[PDB]
Design an enzyme around this catalytic site. Sequence first.
Site, PDB file in Angstrom:
ATOM      1  N   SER B  78     -17.104  29.801  23.248  1.00 24.37           N
ATOM      2  CA  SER B  78     -16.864  30.547  24.478  1.00 24.37           C
ATOM      3  C   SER B  78     -17.768  31.762  24.439  1.00 24.37           C
ATOM      4  O   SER B  78     -18.292  32.116  23.374  1.00 24.37           O
ATOM      5  CB  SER B  78     -15.395  30.983  24.595  1.00 24.37           C
ATOM      6  OG  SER B  78     -14.915  31.558  23.388  1.00 24.37           O
ATOM      7  N   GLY B 116      -5.790  25.467  24.454  1.00 21.75           N
ATOM      8  CA  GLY B 116      -7.140  24.956  24.223  1.00 21.75           C
ATOM      9  C   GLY B 116      -7.838  25.865  23.228  1.00 21.75           C
ATOM     10  O   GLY B 116      -8.923  26.377  23.492  1.00 21.75           O
ATOM     11  N   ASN B 140      -5.988  19.551  21.870  1.00 19.62           N
ATOM     12  CA  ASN B 140      -5.907  18.095  22.009  1.00 19.62           C
ATOM     13  C   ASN B 140      -6.668  17.328  20.918  1.00 19.62           C
ATOM     14  O   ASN B 140      -6.737  16.092  20.938  1.00 19.62           O
ATOM     15  CB  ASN B 140      -6.351  17.673  23.424  1.00 19.62           C
ATOM     16  CG  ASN B 140      -7.791  18.059  23.750  1.00 19.62           C
ATOM     17  OD1 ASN B 140      -8.452  18.812  23.026  1.00 19.62           O
ATOM     18  ND2 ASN B 140      -8.285  17.537  24.869  1.00 19.62           N
ATOM     19  N   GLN B 144      -9.421  19.580  15.054  1.00 17.02           N
ATOM     20  CA  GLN B 144      -9.301  21.020  15.276  1.00 17.02           C
ATOM     21  C   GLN B 144      -8.014  21.577  14.682  1.00 17.02           C
ATOM     22  O   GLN B 144      -8.044  22.625  14.036  1.00 17.02           O
ATOM     23  CB  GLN B 144      -9.426  21.365  16.760  1.00 17.02           C
ATOM     24  CG  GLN B 144     -10.854  21.224  17.256  1.00 17.02           C
ATOM     25  CD  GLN B 144     -11.047  21.644  18.697  1.00 17.02           C
ATOM     26  OE1 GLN B 144     -10.105  21.673  19.489  1.00 17.02           O
ATOM     27  NE2 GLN B 144     -12.287  21.973  19.045  1.00 17.02           N
ATOM     28  N   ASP B 166      -2.262  17.169  24.665  1.00 15.22           N
ATOM     29  CA  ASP B 166      -2.895  17.347  25.960  1.00 15.22           C
ATOM     30  C   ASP B 166      -1.973  18.311  26.708  1.00 15.22           C
ATOM     31  O   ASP B 166      -0.808  17.987  26.957  1.00 15.22           O
ATOM     32  CB  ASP B 166      -2.972  15.983  26.665  1.00 15.22           C
ATOM     33  CG  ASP B 166      -3.602  16.046  28.056  1.00 15.22           C
ATOM     34  OD1 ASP B 166      -3.717  17.132  28.666  1.00 15.22           O
ATOM     35  OD2 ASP B 166      -3.973  14.966  28.555  1.00 15.22           O
ATOM     36  N   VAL B 167      -2.485  19.502  27.045  1.00 14.56           N
ATOM     37  CA  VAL B 167      -1.670  20.542  27.689  1.00 14.56           C
ATOM     38  C   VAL B 167      -1.037  20.077  29.014  1.00 14.56           C
ATOM     39  O   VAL B 167       0.056  20.516  29.359  1.00 14.56           O
ATOM     40  CB  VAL B 167      -2.438  21.889  27.845  1.00 14.56           C
ATOM     41  CG1 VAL B 167      -3.518  21.812  28.920  1.00 14.56           C
ATOM     42  CG2 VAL B 167      -1.474  23.042  28.106  1.00 14.56           C
ATOM     43  N   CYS B 312     -27.593  24.795  25.382  1.00 16.12           N
ATOM     44  CA  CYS B 312     -27.891  26.205  25.105  1.00 16.12           C
ATOM     45  C   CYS B 312     -29.061  26.748  25.932  1.00 16.12           C
ATOM     46  O   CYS B 312     -28.970  27.846  26.488  1.00 16.12           O
ATOM     47  CB  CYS B 312     -28.153  26.417  23.613  1.00 16.12           C
ATOM     48  SG  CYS B 312     -26.712  26.104  22.575  1.00 16.12           S
TER      49      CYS B 312
HETATM   50  C1  LIG Z   1     -14.877  25.692  25.739  1.00 14.55           C
HETATM   51  S1  LIG Z   1     -13.572  25.372  24.770  1.00 14.55           S
HETATM   52  C2  LIG Z   1     -12.925  26.852  24.315  1.00 14.55           C
HETATM   53  C3  LIG Z   1     -12.138  26.780  22.996  1.00 14.55           C
HETATM   54  C4  LIG Z   1     -11.596  28.132  22.501  1.00 14.55           C
HETATM   55  N1  LIG Z   1     -10.606  28.684  23.429  1.00 14.55           N
HETATM   56  C5  LIG Z   1     -12.697  29.131  22.220  1.00 14.55           C
HETATM   57  O1  LIG Z   1     -12.747  30.174  22.905  1.00 14.55           O
HETATM   58  O2  LIG Z   1     -13.527  28.898  21.307  1.00 14.55           O
HETATM   59  C6  LIG Z   1     -12.482  24.543  25.728  1.00 14.55           C
HETATM   60  C7  LIG Z   1     -11.381  23.859  24.920  1.00 14.55           C
HETATM   61  O3  LIG Z   1     -10.344  23.317  25.751  1.00 14.55           O
HETATM   62  C8  LIG Z   1      -9.937  22.083  25.155  1.00 14.55           C
HETATM   63  N2  LIG Z   1      -9.215  21.210  26.108  1.00 14.55           N
HETATM   64  C9  LIG Z   1      -9.742  20.605  27.192  1.00 14.55           C
HETATM   65  N3  LIG Z   1      -8.798  19.886  27.844  1.00 14.55           N
HETATM   66  C10 LIG Z   1      -7.641  20.038  27.180  1.00 14.55           C
HETATM   67  C11 LIG Z   1      -6.251  19.545  27.331  1.00 14.55           C
HETATM   68  N4  LIG Z   1      -5.940  18.739  28.375  1.00 14.55           N
HETATM   69  N5  LIG Z   1      -5.321  19.933  26.416  1.00 14.55           N
HETATM   70  C12 LIG Z   1      -5.639  20.745  25.380  1.00 14.55           C
HETATM   71  N6  LIG Z   1      -6.891  21.225  25.189  1.00 14.55           N
HETATM   72  C13 LIG Z   1      -7.915  20.915  26.030  1.00 14.55           C
HETATM   73  C14 LIG Z   1     -11.239  21.481  24.659  1.00 14.55           C
HETATM   74  O4  LIG Z   1     -11.011  20.472  23.675  1.00 14.55           O
HETATM   75  C15 LIG Z   1     -11.934  22.702  24.100  1.00 14.55           C
HETATM   76  O5  LIG Z   1     -11.585  22.953  22.738  1.00 14.55           O
END
Ligand SMILES: C[S@@+](CC[C@H](N)C(=O)[O-])C[C@H]1O[C@@H](n2cnc3c(N)ncnc32)[C@H](O)[C@@H]1O
Lengths: 337, 337
Positions: B78, B116, B140, B144, B166-167, B312
């Site tokens: 992020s 997430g 998910n 991780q 899965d949220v 990137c």
């Molecule tokens: C760009 S990342 C950010 C991760 C973390 N918050 C960070 O700042 O490093 C987005 C995250 O949301 C997760 N994600 C996407 N859909 C999801 C779901 N339905 N349930 C849980 N996690 C999810 C992805 O696997 C990913 O790890």
Amino acid sequence: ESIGEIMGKLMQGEIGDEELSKRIKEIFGKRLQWGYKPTHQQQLAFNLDFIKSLKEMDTYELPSAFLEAAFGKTIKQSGCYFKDETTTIDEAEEASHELYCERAQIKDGQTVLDIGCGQGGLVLHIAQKYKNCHVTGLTNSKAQKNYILMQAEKLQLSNVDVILADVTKHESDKTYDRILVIETIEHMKNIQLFMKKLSTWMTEDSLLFVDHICHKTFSHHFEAIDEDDWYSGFIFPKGCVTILSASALLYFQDDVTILDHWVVNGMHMARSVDAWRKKLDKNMELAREILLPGLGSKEAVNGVITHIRTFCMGGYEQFSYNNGEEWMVAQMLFKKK
Amino acid sequence: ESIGEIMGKLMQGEIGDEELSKRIKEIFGKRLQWGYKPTHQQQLAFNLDFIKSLKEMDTYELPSAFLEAAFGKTIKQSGCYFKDETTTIDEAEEASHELYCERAQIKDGQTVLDIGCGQGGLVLHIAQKYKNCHVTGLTNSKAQKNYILMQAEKLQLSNVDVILADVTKHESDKTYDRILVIETIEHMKNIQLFMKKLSTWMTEDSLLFVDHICHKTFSHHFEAIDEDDWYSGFIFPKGCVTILSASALLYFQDDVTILDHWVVNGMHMARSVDAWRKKLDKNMELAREILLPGLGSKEAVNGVITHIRTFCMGGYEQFSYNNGEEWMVAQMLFKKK
Ligand SMILES: C[S@@+](CC[C@H](N)C(=O)[O-])C[C@H]1O[C@@H](n2cnc3c(N)ncnc32)[C@H](O)[C@@H]1O
Ligand SMILES: C[S@@+](CC[C@H](N)C(=O)[O-])C[C@H]1O[C@@H](n2cnc3c(N)ncnc32)[C@H](O)[C@@H]1O
């Protein structure tokens, strides 16, 4: 030059329209410099500071004959809507009334409350168009109440009532299908409390429609930035008017929830104040005669006329700025939480 | 030239960095033309159409050794925060974690949910800084979860748990003092339902903090406008990412209420993806070695590396556009209704 010197020349009619417009445009230009920030980061910091500040807060009337000589047919005292360059003020009032009816999703049979209804143009429009609606206007002016009731009688409308109240002090358990607020929220000292109060006059089926003058980017109180602004405090002598940004009310969803959001370009408001200015100028002799008994002297009459005329001239500069893309009109539709 | 021709040259490493950056910048320039409207009236019409459309809607993973070779110390995925030109990615991760803690008003003793949570940098940061907090990460990804639990063990942290879910499918009566969503809402197919679900995991004392990539003015799905855009569908092969405007979530207050709102200028994100690109380039030989057993061939390794590196390079052009004043990061703080 001092404030008093410019004010002296203005009241004596020594400032020509070209200079007057130029002076007021420059005052508003300085407000734009004050309000625009170099980054969106800074813009939001500035905007949220203003929103947070709002959440911490909290006899003479013009004769109807004069108002009829200056304003359009229904004495609408808000931005109108002009389809054409040649659209008349009367047509623009009706077009704006119709726009509110569409956007507020008015339907026959609904109970309708118009908050700060003024001379009641919208109240009378809805009552006539939708015979099964019951329409209530709320105003803090006894003269306005009396005007509306007389007009309803003349128009054979049996579905109108008027509440005489300061809306901030009005207590009732009554609810309405539709609540309309047309350029009245600008005068509210406590917006969060205002929206809360309105939500208590709504059921789950109700909609709330708010129309307010705005700037597209930032909020500000209608007041002088510096000592060079003779205009703002002349138009509104008290700190009573707030110009919310086009998005400011999105942060006032404690008690209501947004469904839709629009703006109407500032040229519509510009054309509205221009039409009032031109009509007043045309009826200048008549206006002076109407105002004389109630004001006592020709000098007091001149002062009142100068005030209203300058309001229109300044309003023109404000709302026409950058082809209507600075100050304009915001509209929002809400349901109860 | 066709999509396949540009894609062929890209995968073979025939497009130099200068040309690659130029091509991707032009693609984003066209998105700006698509998104900006001539009037605020038209801008809001466009923006509300998008918001309304949202309300109608609804095996392989990279080894941790590779992720450690490309990303910063805590594998933050992020936008980070760079005080100086010479701020390292590790420092920028910590600075961003600290910024979230301040803006989400994290205090010792709170229950905290990170939705997430990715590789858990923020989860581990809060757990270490606030020993009386209990911190739950939700992800998910089983890999991780396992990574976070191992790190918590190594760091002697006893106040961490991870929910594997899965949220969108996760059901619980559990509530939390603080809910954090760091660049995860972009992946949510149904935002209104998502915010509703989060509100049920809050009490009256809770706060919700959302950080999301945005454009300052308009919203868009991360997808090709036309056939000339080879980039968008290469980076995200499915229609899974939405870039909300900086204000879009203000229209999702059915179940939560806004308290504060910020943006962080896009140069911070630009510097984040630049740091990842440069670190990957430095560790290129090592990265190729790490990826080889799990991918089967050097060609499959090259493809995965090209994908991440181009992400990137493109991200740099997107977020650095007009000195960070187009695409950036939005942050919002909410309470329950
Ligand atoms: C760009 S990342 C950010 C991760 C973390 N918050 C960070 O700042 O490093 C987005 C995250 O949301 C997760 N994600 C996407 N859909 C999801 C779901 N339905 N349930 C849980 N996690 C999810 C992805 O696997 C990913 O790890
Ligand atoms: C600019 S006017 C608009 C009137 C009308 N809605 C129209 O469109 O012509 C604002 C109105 O709000 C009224 N108003 C201001 N404060 C008020 C209060 N506390 N209670 C009721 N009315 C109020 C003013 O008297 C004025 O008529």
